[PDB]
Amino acid sequence: MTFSGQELTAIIKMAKSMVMADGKIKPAEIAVMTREFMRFGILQDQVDLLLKASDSIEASQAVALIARMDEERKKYVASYLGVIMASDGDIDDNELALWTLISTLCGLPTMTVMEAINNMKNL
Amino acid sequence: IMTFSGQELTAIIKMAKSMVMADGKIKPAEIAVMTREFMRFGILQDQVDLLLKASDSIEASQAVALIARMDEERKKYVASYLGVIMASDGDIDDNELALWTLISTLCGLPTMTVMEAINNMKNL
Amino acid sequence: MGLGRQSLNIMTFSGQELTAIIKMAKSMVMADGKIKPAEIAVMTREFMRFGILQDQVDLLLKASDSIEASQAVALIARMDEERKKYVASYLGVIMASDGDIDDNELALWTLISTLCGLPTMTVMEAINNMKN
Amino acid sequence: IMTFSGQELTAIIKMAKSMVMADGKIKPAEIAVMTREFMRFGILQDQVDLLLKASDSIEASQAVALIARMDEERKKYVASYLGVIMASDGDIDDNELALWTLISTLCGLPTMTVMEAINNMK
Ligand SMILES: [Mg+2]
Ligand SMILES: [Mg+2]
Ligand SMILES: [Mg+2]
């Protein structure tokens, strides 16, 4: 599972869009977003670079870039978005809803939070 | 007069369905606003029903693409329409506003207050 | 002419019974994972026949999200047969369109009725009970 | 074997019964799965008719309550069992899926795919 700089900028764009939706400051959730993204196999500083790059692209362009991925790559993008909002393995109703919406628009497969966690472990 | 093609109106209702279904619950208030205010895009009840059916045959990613390429004035009214769906008595709750914000972000729509959305729709 | 002692009855439902009714209706219509705005409108319009004011409907609907489907079943299952018949009639008219119900809809209505202990009826008998 | 009590096995067959009767058609292939899989809860083949008959003594709503109160591990096996009954070659049609989901919702059972149910049982 390789990804271009453009594709990684899209993926982090989706994570950013999702976590900003509720307007709240949530330190642990941002830290999951940043730590787990490294499982794609960049370093922390590269995650920070890519996140700042994402400010310069349209979220709608990110949608398009993601939606054209093969199913294997989409499975792990969905798994990554799923683990972000997990707390002790649980997500609440409003979090599942957001994960569900961005998944639908991106054409991503449906999964449980347990599957998303198990997916990010094998990566 | 503001006009929208059939594929654009299909994309719009796809977005509305995706939004109101996101939490896996039916809130009849939201489905009633969804179908009534959709008429303000210049269509009859019979066309609304057709388009709801039409939307099942498109991918939500296709709908995103169709909306995101729209001019700013039209995106303004799509954002507004999505806003009034989730609103009640001029108020939006947190969970619902989070969903409206996210879908707006993904579709390239302008941010607005709920007051603004309600007033925009009164002008169509 | 002899008139006749008068007998009055009123069909009554507790708040949690009403919440249960609407939770059963939601569960039935979500089963196939699709939303039909027409079925939802009949659902809310005909719910009023249960004896509530329009402005109470929204909060009862909101109360339904805080209860388990399994608890709504327990609450319906223990009703007397007259009230069960009315609940079954209600569920039966939600998915009917022009007094007809397709086989899949009929199956869903049959299954929920079985689980809640409601009487079996045709969609015609459903539609009449609700009209009076 | 996932362990259930006698009164639980009674509730489970009552739910499988309710589900397969919903459309008015009692398909031998489905009854075969209903039979073969229930054996994996520690019931001999000849005994499935006995449990089915024992289920006449309880109402469907009482079966619902016996299932709704079970722990999440027991629930998983109940949902998986109900899911495989109407499946064919690993697939389930849209109508069958709608029936499985309604009964799962009413019994407070977890959502799963037909593939999960198959592998849970296997
Ligand atoms: Mg909803
Ligand atoms: Mg439906
Ligand atoms: Mg059958």
Q: Which residue among C26, C38, C58 places its CB closest to the CB of B26?
A: C26
Q: How far apart are CA D4 and CA D17, in angstroms?
A: 18
- Beta carbons of B63 and B14 less than 8 angstroms apart: yes
CA A64 to mean position of chain CA atoms: 15
Tell me whether residue C10 is exposed, middle or buried, using C-beta atoms within 10 angstroms of its C-beta: 0 to 12, 13 to 18, 19 or more.
Answer: exposed
Pick the ligand that lies closest to the CA of residue A101: 1
Place of tokens 């309550």: D65
Known binding residue D23? Answer is yes
List the structure tokens of A74: 């989409």
Q: How far apart are CA C124 and CA C93, in angstroms?
A: 9
Query: Are B106 and A17 within 8 A, CB to CB?
Result: yes
Q: Which residue among B25, B31, B56 places its CB closest to the CB of C40?
A: B31
Nearest CA in chain B to A96: B23
List the structure tokens of A48: 């920070």
Tell me, in Å, the resolution of the deposited structure.
2.0
CATH numeric code, C14-132? 1.10.3680.10
List the structure tokens of B91: 């108020």
In degrees, rounded to 5, the angle at the alpha carbon of residue A91 between the alpha carbons of residues A86 and A97 is 115
The amino acid occupying position D10 is T
Domain map (residue ranges) of chain C: 14-132
Query: Are C69 and D106 within 8 A, CB to CB?
Result: yes
Q: Which residues contact C85 (CB under 8 A, 6 or more apart)?
A: C118, C119, C121, C129
Give phi and psi for B38, each to the nearest 5: -60, -30
* Residue C44 near chain B (CB below 8 Å): yes
CATH numeric code, A1-123? 1.10.3680.10
Half-sphere exposure of A116 (CA within 13 A, CB side): 26
Q: Which residues contact A92 (CB under 8 A, 6 or more apart)?
A: none
Q: Which class in CATH covers the domain with range B1-124?
A: mainly alpha
CA B16 to mean position of chain CA atoms: 4
C-alpha gyration radius of chain A: 13
* Residue B27 near chain A (CB below 8 Å): no
In degrees, rounded to 5, the angle at the alpha carbon of residue B107 between the alpha carbons of residues B101 and B109 is 65
Q: How far is C113 from chain B (nearest CA, A)?
A: 21
Give the SS3 label for residue C131.
coil
Contact residues, chain B, for C31 at CB < 8 Å? none
Contact residues, chain C, for D96 at CB < 8 Å? none
- Beta carbons of D19 and D82 less than 8 angstroms apart: yes
Q: How far apart are CA C51 and CA C29, in angstroms?
A: 22
Query: Are B28 and C35 within 8 A, CB to CB?
Result: no
Contact residues, chain B, for A105 at CB < 8 Å? 18, 60-61, 63-64, 103, 106
Give the SS3 label for residue D90.
coil
Known binding residue C98? Answer is no
Half-sphere exposure of B30 (CA within 13 A, CB side): 24
Q: How far apart are CA C105 and CA D55, in angstroms?
A: 26
Contact residues, chain B, for C58 at CB < 8 Å? 29, 88
Superfamily of chain region D5-122? TerB-like (1.10.3680.10)
Place of tokens 């269509």: B43
Q: How far apart are CA B76 and CA C118, in angstroms?
A: 49
Cα distances from D33 to residues C9, C81, D2, D53, in angstroms, run 49, 35, 17, 18
- Beta carbons of C113 and C120 less than 8 angstroms apart: yes
* Residue B113 near chain A (CB below 8 Å): no
Pick the ligand that lies closest to the CA of residue B23: 1
The amino acid occupying position A77 is V
Q: Which of D120, D4, D121, D111 is nearest to D66 (CA)?
A: D4
Q: Cα dihedral sign for D15, D17, D21, D26?
A: positive
- Per residue, the 3-state secondary structure of C74-97, as one string, reads HHHHCCCHHHHHHHHHHHHHHCCE
Q: How far apart are CA C108 and CA A43, in angstroms?
A: 53
Q: How far apart are CA A52 and CA B51, in angstroms?
A: 39
